[PDB]
Design a protein around this ligand. Structure first.
Ligand SMILES: NC(=O)c1ccc[n+]([C@@H]2O[C@H](COP(=O)([O-])OP(=O)(O)OC[C@H]3O[C@@H](n4cnc5c(N)ncnc54)[C@H](O)[C@@H]3O)[C@@H](O)[C@H]2O)c1
Ligand SMILES: NC(=O)c1ccc[n+]([C@@H]2O[C@H](COP(=O)([O-])OP(=O)(O)OC[C@H]3O[C@@H](n4cnc5c(N)ncnc54)[C@H](O)[C@@H]3O)[C@@H](O)[C@H]2O)c1
Ligand SMILES: NC(=O)c1ccc[n+]([C@@H]2O[C@H](COP(=O)([O-])OP(=O)(O)OC[C@H]3O[C@@H](n4cnc5c(N)ncnc54)[C@H](O)[C@@H]3O)[C@@H](O)[C@H]2O)c1
Ligand SMILES: NC(=O)c1ccc[n+]([C@@H]2O[C@H](COP(=O)([O-])OP(=O)(O)OC[C@H]3O[C@@H](n4cnc5c(N)ncnc54)[C@H](O)[C@@H]3O)[C@@H](O)[C@H]2O)c1
Ligand SMILES: [Cl-]
Ligand SMILES: [Cl-]
Ligand code: NA
Ligand code: NA
Lengths: 298, 300, 298, 300
C-alpha cells in the first residue's frame, strides 16, 4: 500500500488524514511534537474504519523514524515574526523527514506558503518538481463555491484557475473559469463577479472572523487531500499549486502559484497562460510581494 | 425512497439500472415486453447488492402497473423512415402506457432518433415540456472530453465541454465552449488536431458499432443517462446539453434540439442561450435543418 | 432534498455534518448557541464542496427557526452534576427544536446518553420509536476495530452486537460477533478476547487520556452519521441503539442500548436475543445503573 | 498504477472491467480472441470516464503481449465431459500464453467448471498455489445473503455468510456460519424457510438462466470477481470463500475446493479450517466426491 505521512496533527492535518483514510488511498502516519495528540487522533480515526469501511492503517507518532519510505509527505505544522517561527518549524520538519523518504513528493501547507515551500525545497534538496505547496486549490475552491451559489448551478460543473498566493498576493483570473465549458462571465455580470473575486481574496479571513479563535480546516484539508490523491493515483490533475519557476511568466528562482499538471512525478508540467496586460499587472505585483517575503527568509 | 422506472431492459437500460442501484438513488423497476428478461436482469442486479452494498429494491416486470408513481421514467426500448416508424410505434406504446401512471415524473428519452422520439414522447404524454427531455448531448460531450483529456495529457475530471444538436451529422460541436480547469481547450490542442477530435466525436457512435460489429455502445450511453437521472432526483442543477423543446431559442421553434440547460428537480429549469458566432450559427442551422426533416417525417 | 439539523456545532456535530454532506444525504443545518461558530464551520464545509463534489446546502445558525421541517435532528450539544448541566441543555434544545420538526427522528448523542434520550422523549412527546440515542454503534465499532486488528482481517468482514450504555454500563456480547459469518471466538482465544472486551469498555477513556484536553469525535461522528443515513435511506440496519423498552429483556419504562432494525420510521423493530445467564447478569447490572441515573433525572 | 488483465471480453469480463475502472483500482486490459470486440468494449467504457470520474487506462486487445506484467489476471473466457473438454482447451490456451508474461500475478479463474478449471490453471501456469484461485463462493454467498436479508427485513450490508464446495449440487451450505450484525441467522429465519433459501441458493445460477432463456447471470458474478480483485490489489485481507488448493484441509488432498480463506496481496494467505459437525461433514464429503469426479475427468 502507499504510505502518506502528515507532519502536524492539528485541525488541517487530522482532517486531511480523515479524507485520505476514507478513500483508502494508503496507510497514514500522523506525526506531531506533542505526545499523545497524534496517537489519540489516529486511534479515533482508525476506530471509525468498520463504520466507513476502509482498510488502511492509521497510526500516530512522535518519532520521525515511523515516517520512513513515505510516498507523500504533507506538512501542516505551521503556527515578519511569522516568517521566523514558521521557518524554524519547517526546517526542523523537513530536515528530519526528507532523508527518511528520499522518493517522496512533499506538499507544504504551512504559511507563508510560497516561502515555506521554497524553504522545504532548499532543506530537502529534492528535485523541484517533487516539492510543492497547497494554496491555489483552496482559493479556487472558494471562488467555485461562490460562483456555483450565485449562478444556481452544481459545484460539479464550475471550474476555475488562479495564481499567486493567498489574500493580497492572490492573482484572480475570472477569465479562466467556466461552467460546463461556458465562460463564467456569461452567467455572472461584472460587478457581481468583482464582488465574488474580492470575497475569494478575503476568504480565509472571513472564516477566521466567524470562528473567532480558529481558522478554516475543512476546505484546506480537502484541497490538500485532492493534491495527495493526484500524486498517489497519477491523475494528472490541472490545478494551481505553488511550484518552482524557471522562467515561466517571466519569473525565476521563486515558488509561485501557477497552473500545473500534477501527477506521480509531482509537477509534470507548468502551464503558461496567455495573460493580458491587466492580469500580468496583478501577477507582477504579487510576485513582488512574494519576492519580498523570500528575501526576508534569506 | 425515490422510484425510477426504466422501459426497455436491453444493454443501455440494464446498465443504467446498475449505476442507479449502486448509488442507491432509489427503487428501480425494469420493464420490458419480453417475459423473463427484465425479471432475470433485475434479480441478477439485486443479488449483487450484498457485495456492492446498496439497499434499494430492484425488480423486473412486464406490467406497466408496476411503474406507477415513478419520479423518473427512462425510455431505452428503441430498435430512415422505417427506423423512425418502428421507433415511433415503440415510443408511443411505451409512453401512452407509462405516462398516465406517473403524472409527476420527468421523462428521459434515449431511443433513436433521439430528438424526434423525445418530441413524440412530449406529445403522447401531454406533460409540461420541461419534464420531457432526451439524452444525447451528455454522451457526445463525454466522448469529446475523453479524447481531449487523452490528447492534452490531463485528468478527465478537469475537462468540461458543451455542444448542441443531435448525434452524428446533426451534432453541433462547440470547441470554443470547452475548458480544462477553466482554461480554453484551444490553448492545449492545435487546430488541426482539434478538428480531428471533433470529427471523431461526430462519428463516435459508429466507431463503436464498427468494432463490436453486432452491437452498439451502452456503457457511456448508460452513464450519461444515469447522470441526468441523478441530476433530477438530487436536484443538482447540472449544466448540461440535453434535448429540450425550443420556442425561440437559437431561432428554433416547435422542435426538440440539443441545447445547454440547467437540469434539476423540475426537469429543464432553464434553457441557456449562448452567444454563437457566425461559423457556429452556420453549423447549428444546418443541424436544425436535419432535425426538422426527421421531425417532419415523424409528423407524416 | 432531505433536511438534517445538527444541534451543537462542536467536534462531533461538525464532523457528523462533514460525513453527511460528503455523502449528499441532504441539506445540513448546523445550530449553536455561540454566534459565528456554526456559521464559520458551515461555510468552511460548504467551500469544500467543489473539491469533494457534493451538492447540498450547509448552513450555520443561532436561530432554531432555521431547523424547521427537518427529517432528522441530531443533538450533540452536551457538556451527579453532569446530569444536571446536560439535562437543562437537552430540555432547551428539544423544547425549541421538536415543535418545528414534528415528523423528525431525533438522534441523541449527549451524555449521559440513555438518560438524555429518555428526557428528549419526554420533552418532544414524539412517538418513542422516533427518539433514539447513539452509543452502541460507536462501542461496537471500537470492538470491531480491535477484533479486525488482532485477527488480521478486513474491518469490512467483522460484525458485532452489544448492549447497555458506555463504560461500566456497556454489556459486551462477544458471542454475538462474527467474521464473515464465522464466530469471532474461532479466531481469538478467550484471554485475548477478554482483553479486547475490556479495551472496548474503556475505549472512550483511552482517547481522552491520549488527547489530554479533548474527547473522541471521528468515530462518534461516524457512528451518528451511519444512524442518520439508516433513517434517511430507510436501510433497515441492524445496530445497537438506545431505545425505549416496553418489556424486552424484562425491562420497562427506560431507554437502554438494544439491537434494533433502524429505518425511516426510526426503531422499526427491537430484537430479542436469547441471552444466557452470564450475559443476563451483565445486562441486569447495567440496567440497574441506567435506572439509577434515570431516577436522579426524575 | 496497478495493472489488471481480463481474459474474455464477454458479459462477466466487461462488467468486471467496468467496476474495477469506476473504482480506479488500476489500468485495465481486456483481451479476447475475437477481433474488435474487446477494443469496442474498452473504448465504450473509457468514454464513460469523464462522467463517472475515473482516471485509469482501459484498452482492448487481441494480443497477449499487452497483458505483460499484470498484478492480477482474471479469466472469464469459458463457454458434461464435452463442457469440461471445451473449457479445458480454452483455459489451457489462455493460461499458457498469459502466465509467462505476468509471473508475479495472482490468477483469478471464473470459467466453469470452476474448481476444475482453477486446478488446470494452477498446472499450466506452475504458479504457487496461493496465487491461483477461483471465484464461486463469493457469488453463492451473495445470493444467500440477498435472500436472507429480504426475508429478515434487514440491510444487505449487515448479512454475512460462509459456504464451501462448488456451484449447484457441489455447494456446501453452512447456515450455522451466517450472521446478521453478529446475530445467528437461525434466530431470524425459521428452519423450513431457511431450508428453502438454501435450496434457492443451490439453484441460483439456473434460476437466472431460466428467466433470461438465452443467457446467464453476470452482474453478481462480476461483482464477486471484482471484490476478489480488490482484495488482492488493496491487500484488504478479506475473509471469503474461494476455490483454493487443499493439502489436507477438511480431509481433502490435491484438489481445488471452495473454502474459507483470508485473501490479500499474496493471494490466499490462509485457509481457514472450520469445526464442522457431522451433518455438515456429510454435505462436504458428498460435494468433494462430485468435485473429485470432475477433476478425474479433466485428468483423463
Ligand atoms: N488555505 C491555506 O493555505 C491554509 C488554511 C489553513 C491553515 N494553513 C496553515 O496550515 C498550518 C496548520 O494549520 P492548523 O490550523 O491545522 O494548525 P494547528 O495549530 O491546529 O496544528 C499544527 C500542529 O503542528 C504541530 N507542530 C508544531 N511544530 C511541530 C514540529 N516541529 N513537528 C511536528 N508537529 C509540529 C502542533 O503541535 C500542532 O498539533 C498553519 O501553518 C496554517 O497557517 C493554510
Ligand atoms: N447515445 C445515444 O443517443 C444512444 C446510445 C445507446 C442507445 N441508444 C438507443 O437506445 C435504444 C436502446 O438501445 P439498446 O442498445 O439498449 O437496445 P437493446 O436492443 O439491447 O434493448 C432494447 C430493449 O427494449 C425492449 N423493447 C422493445 N419494445 C418495447 C416496448 N414496446 N416496451 C418495452 N420494452 C420494449 C426489447 O425487448 C429490448 O430488451 C435504441 O433505440 C438505440 O438506438 C441511443
Ligand atoms: N461515543 C459517545 O457516546 C460520545 C462520544 C463523544 C462525545 N459524546 C457527547 O456528545 C456531546 C458533544 O461532544 P463534543 O465533543 O462535540 O462537544 P463540544 O463541546 O465540542 O461541542 C458542543 C457544542 O454544543 C454547543 N452548545 C451548548 N449548549 C447549547 C444549546 N443550548 N444549544 C445549541 N448548542 C449548544 C456548544 O456551544 C458547543 O459548540 C457531549 O455531550 C459529549 O459528552 C458522546
Ligand atoms: N458464478 C459463476 O461461477 C459464474 C458466473 C458467470 C459466468 N461463469 C463462467 O464464466 C465464463 C464466461 O461467462 P460469460 O457469460 O462472460 O460468457 P461470454 O460467452 O459472454 O464471454 C466469454 C468471452 O470469452 C471469449 N473467449 C473464448 N475463448 C477465448 C480464448 N481462448 N481467449 C480469449 N478470449 C476467449 C469469447 O470470445 C467471449 O467474448 C463461462 O465459462 C461461464 O460458465 C461462472
Ligand atoms: Cl510567501
Ligand atoms: Cl444513562
Ligand atoms: Na472530518
Ligand atoms: Na455495468
Amino acid at each position: 500500500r502507499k504510505k502518506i505521512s502528515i507532519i502536524g496533527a492539528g485541525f488541517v492535518g487530522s482532517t486531511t488524514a480523515h479524507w485520505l483514510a476514507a478513500k483508502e488511498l494508503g496507510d497514514i502516519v500522523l506525526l506531531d511534537i506533542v505526545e499523545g495528540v497524534p496517537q489519540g487522533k489516529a486511534l479515533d480515526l482508525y476506530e471509525a474504519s468498520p463504520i466507513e469501511g476502509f482498510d488502511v492503517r492509521v497510526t500516530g507518532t512522535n518519532n520521525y523514524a515511523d515516517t520512513a519510505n513515505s510516498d507523500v509527505i504533507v506538512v501542516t505544522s505551521g503556527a515578519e515574526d511569522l516568517i521566523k517561527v514558521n521557518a524554524d518549524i519547517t526546517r526542523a520538519c523537513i530536515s528530519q523527514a526528507a532523508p527518511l523518504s528520499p522518493n517522496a513528493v512533499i506538499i507544504m501547507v504551512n504559511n507563508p506558503l510560497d516561502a515555506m515551500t521554497y524553504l522545504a525545497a532548499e532543506v530537502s534538496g529534492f528535485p523541484k518538481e517533487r516539492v510543492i505547496g497547497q494554496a491555489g486549490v483552496l482559493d479556487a475552491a472558494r471562488y467555485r463555491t461562490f460562483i456555483a451559489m450565485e449562478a444556481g448551478v452544481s459545484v460539479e460543473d464550475v471550474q476555475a484557475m488562479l495564481m499567486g498566493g493567498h489574500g493580497d498576493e492572490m492573482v484572480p483570473l475570472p477569465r479562466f473559469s467556466c461552467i460546463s465549458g461556458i465562460p463564467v462571465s456569461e452567467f455572472i455580470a461584472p460587478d457581481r463577479l468583482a464582488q465574488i473575486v474580492e470575497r475569494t481574496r478575503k476568504g480565509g479571513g472571513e472564516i477566521v472572523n466567524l470562528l473567532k479563535t480558529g481558522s478554516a480546516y475543512y476546505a484546506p484539508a480537502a484541497a490538500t487531500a485532492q493534491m495527495v490523491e493526484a500524486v498517489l493515483k497519477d491523475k494528472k490533475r490541472v490545478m494551481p499549486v505553488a511550484a518552482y519557476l524557471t522562467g515561466q511568466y517571466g519569473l525565476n528562482d521563486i515558488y509561485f502559484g501557477v497552473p500545473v499538471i500534477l501527477g506521480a512525478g509531482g509537477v509534470e508540467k507548468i502551464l503558461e497562460l496567455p495573460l493580458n496586460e491587466e492580469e500580468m499587472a496583478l501577477l507582477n505585483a504579487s510576485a513582488k510581494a512574494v519576492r519580498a517575503t523570500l528575501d526576508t527568509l534569506k
